[PDB]
Amino acid sequence: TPLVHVASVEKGRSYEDFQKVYNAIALKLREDDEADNYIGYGPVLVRLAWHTSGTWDKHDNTGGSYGGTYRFKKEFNDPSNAGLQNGFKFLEPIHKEFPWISSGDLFSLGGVTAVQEMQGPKIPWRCGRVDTPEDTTPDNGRLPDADKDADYVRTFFQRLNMNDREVVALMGAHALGKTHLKRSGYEGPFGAANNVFTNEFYLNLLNEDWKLEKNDANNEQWDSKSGYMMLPTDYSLIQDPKYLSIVKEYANDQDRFFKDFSKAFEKLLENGITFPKDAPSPFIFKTLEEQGL
Numbered sequence: 026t027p028l029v030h031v032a033s034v035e036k037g038r039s040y041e042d043f044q045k046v047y048n049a050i051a052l053k054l055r056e057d058d059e060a061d062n063y064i065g066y067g068p069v070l071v072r073l074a075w076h077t078s079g080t081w082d083k084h085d086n087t088g089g090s091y092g093g094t095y096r097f098k099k100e101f102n103d104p105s106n107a108g109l110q111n112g113f114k115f116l117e118p119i120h121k122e123f124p125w126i127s128s129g130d131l132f133s134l135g136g137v138t139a140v141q142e143m144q145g146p147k148i149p150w151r152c153g154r155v156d157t158p159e160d161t162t163p164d165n166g167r168l169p170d171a172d173k174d175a176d177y178v179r180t181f182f183q184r185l186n187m188n189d190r191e192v193v194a195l196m197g198a199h200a201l202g203k204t205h206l207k208r209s210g211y212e213g214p215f216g217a218a219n220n221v222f223t224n225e226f227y228l229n230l231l232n233e234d235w236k237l238e239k240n241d242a243n244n245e246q247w248d249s250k251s252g253y254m255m256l257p258t259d260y261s262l263i264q265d266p267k268y269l270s271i272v273k274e275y276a277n278d279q280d281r282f283f284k285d286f287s288k289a290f291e292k293l294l295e296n297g298i299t300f301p302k303d304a305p306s307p308f309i310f311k312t313l314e315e316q317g318l
């Protein structure tokens with residue numbers, strides 16, 4: 026059984042150091058507001074954090090956030106990762122200012138920072154991801170297909186040790202951003218507020234009038250009269266009776282959805298990492314707004 030990946034704190038660093046990195050990311054989020062027709066870089070950094078963590082296989086502990094392997098061509102050229110190069114470019118000048126942070130820690134922190142700055146829940150975050158060599162890069166094809174049903178989604182996420190509630194909560198990130206026809210074969214914003222984190226993914230599934238249409242890439246997606254879109258895999262969460270209960274739950278309780286997302290998101294970003302008994306506790310970073318910055 027599995028590789029063991031032990032978190033090792035960047036030498037001599039503590040909370041204040043990582044807050045500084047969070048702050049640099051958050052300040053650039055605010056400065057580079059123009060990206061994607063004023064959506065900005067928040068959604069793409071969340072997706073980058075998810076895709077670099079979502080390669081994890083619980084059976085042998087390959088993939089995962091630990092190794093920061095997205096920096097290698099095999100993984101950055103994963104067709105599943107198309108468009109994430111923009112997030113990597115965003116983070117370039119951050120990594121240059123703080124060259125002491127590991128790539129794993131930077132990608133996952135990017136995602137925490139974007140969620141919190143887009144007014145989502147606090148996500149405790151732990152340091153100590155260590156860059157691993159190019160031969161540790163997971164092969165392509167570990168991230169999920171969008172054209173599939175609820176049974177697919179349930180089985181898919183068992184590999185990442187997520188249960189129904191964790192799956193439904195994580196999928197609420199599709200409040201954020203949009204599909205881009207050239208990136209994935211799907212096109213259109215997921216919701217109304219593309220760069221504000223809310224439970225609107227659940228309210229939209231339940232409340233909008235959805236039509237199954239073919240987009241310009243000849244792929245089926247669900248389109249609402251409002252101008253939103255959901256993937257077949259999104260919509261499957263209201264087709265499956267067990268998912269649909271959880272959807273209705275988060276639709277009706279913003280705070281529960283926040284708490285559940287934070288835990289599931291932290292878990293996702295931490296799968297495969299052994300934290301020593303003596304490792305520091307998880308950091309909860311203040312937002313710029315909380316700091317008066």
Ligand code: HEM
Pocket residue numbers: 068069071072075108169170171172178195196198199201202203204205206208209210211256258
């Ligand atoms: C069955 C599971 C999932 C599937 C099939 C899926 C698939 C997709 C696809 C095809 C796109 C559009 C990519 C593009 O064209 O730009 C997308 C966007 C996005 N996904 Fe997911 N996703 C899944 C779960 C997740 C999770 C678990 C998260 C994070 C918690 C997440 C975060 C995002 C974000 C933020 C975007 C917007 C990216 C942007 O606006 O640039 N997704 N997803």
